[PDB]
């Protein structure tokens, strides 16, 4: 219902384009921790997969 933050949407665009390394680096820069970056990439990835299934 709420949507995505600007950085979350940026990482979504990066993951859709396939720049996984760039998305991980951007998430780390925005969050400050490798574990948080990995986790956020994980939720965003399942969101992308769920959107693909829904479409």
């Amino acid at each position: 219902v709420a949507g995505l933050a600007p950085y979350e949407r940026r990482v979504i665009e990066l993951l859709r384009n396939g720049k996984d390394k760039r998305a991980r680096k951007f998430s780390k820069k925005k969050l400050g921790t490798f574990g948080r970056a990995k986790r956020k990439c994980e939720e965003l990835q399942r969101i992308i997969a769920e959107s693909r299934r829904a479409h």
Partner: protein
Amino acid sequence: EDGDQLERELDAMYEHYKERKAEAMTLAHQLATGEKTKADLIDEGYNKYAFKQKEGLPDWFLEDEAKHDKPIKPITKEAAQAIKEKLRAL
């Protein structure tokens, strides 16, 4: 209905009230010197005020948001010298 008349009155009153009453150069220096690249520039441009509606909104509210949407970025004495030399006229 469309609100055009009421917007006209509000803008006229705002104009009557108005009648009655370094950061850029720092970023340019950081881009010129081998410190920040294009990707870093867009990464820093994704700010909290990104996607700010600016065309369909009333002038007074846009002026208020422009007054109160300024983020404080670090500045440098080199940038201050550059802006002083740029502003220095004939």
